[PDB]
Design a protein around this ligand. Structure first.
Ligand SMILES: C=CCN(Cc1ccccc1C(=O)NCC1CCCCC1)Cc1ccc2c(c1C(=O)O)OC[C@H](CCC(=O)O)O2
Ligand SMILES: C=CCN(Cc1ccccc1C(=O)NCC1CCCCC1)Cc1ccc2c(c1C(=O)O)OC[C@H](CCC(=O)O)O2
Lengths: 149, 149
């Protein structure tokens, strides 16, 4: 549970926002990319896993599941690459809601930056700091520290 | 001290590696950029502060200290922007040693990637996971979790 992340891909302004969610806390990392390729996905995972103790990644689609580049990054970084099949139906619902919330935040900050990637990082910041009482940022840290002890 | 970060800029292959160090743990984030500008620095800070609770940043030079774009990012993200004067002489030494260790790791992985940015992320991963017995990644999480509590 402390090591489980879910990948998520959403679209805005003709671009792709690649998101990783720490399932147990709702904490996110995200980046803007021109298109979701194996290489972009692989590079994003490598960044993520150098930053948090990533044990398991549920990939966002079959192409990223299949991709040899993605498997090579998961190999490199010690990540168990898994499918994203929503055996629990509440999963699709949580991600859809997260995408809608993120796009809403992006629209609130959109005039505060020329480039979408700036607005996306502003959105990541607001999302992770939002007290819902703890924030997602507080929850990930507490979950992982408890696991270390 | 759980909220205090230090910026550090180093060079390799005609490129700039921008590093943020969490002072109390030695945990790092890093990126490759064509040149250190106020905009690049500002964007890097915005990313960092959406991901960790960044209270204070000691800027790496006077130009980033002066930069209105950097001050605008620190304002946006709730960061106290401070100078990086090593009133403690051990600080210079700690940073120089980190740069040399990072470059050593980069050379150890350099052949496993075509692009420098990939090798730098592999170096970030190895650095943060290295036990010295706790890793820097374990220390940052424990330090912050204690603080939240
Ligand atoms: C100084 C000019 C830059 N912008 C002026 C601006 C333009 C339009 C609206 C508001 C503002 C504004 O001042 N907002 C306040 C503000 C300032 C700093 C941080 C957060 C908020 C903002 C900005 C900074 C760094 C970036 C950006 C952008 C962008 O406009 O998107 O874009 C990606 C770029 C990528 C890295 C690289 O390529 O260097 O880093
Ligand atoms: C399939 C070709 C890609 N490379 C082949 C390669 C080339 C030379 C040596 C070894 C390997 C190799 O397969 N190493 C194993 C390996 C280790 C860790 C992760 C993946 C693979 C590796 C790579 C992947 C993603 C990237 C990269 C790079 C790069 O070569 O630097 O560069 C930046 C790019 C940025 C995102 C974007 O722009 O798409 O993401």
């Amino acid at each position: 549970s402390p090591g489980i992340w879910q990948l998520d891909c959403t679209h805005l302004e003709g671009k792709v926002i690649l998101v990783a969610v720490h399932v147990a806390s709702g904490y996110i990392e995200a980046e803007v990319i021109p298109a979701e390729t194996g290489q972009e996905t692989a590079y994003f995972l490598l960044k993520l896993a150098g930053r948090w103790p990533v044990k398991t990644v549920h990939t966002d689609n079959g192409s990223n599941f299949t991709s040899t580049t993605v498997k090579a990054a998961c190999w490199w970084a010690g990540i168990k690459q898994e499918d994203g099949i929503p055996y629990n139906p509440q999963s699709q619902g949580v991600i859809e809601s997260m995408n809608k919330e993120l796009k809403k935040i992006i629209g609130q900050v959109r005039d505060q930056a020329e480039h979408l990637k700036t607005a996306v990082q502003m959105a990541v910041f607001i999302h992770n700091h939002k007290r819902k009482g703890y924030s997602a940022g507080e929850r990930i840290v507490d979950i992982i520290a408890t696991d270390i002890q």
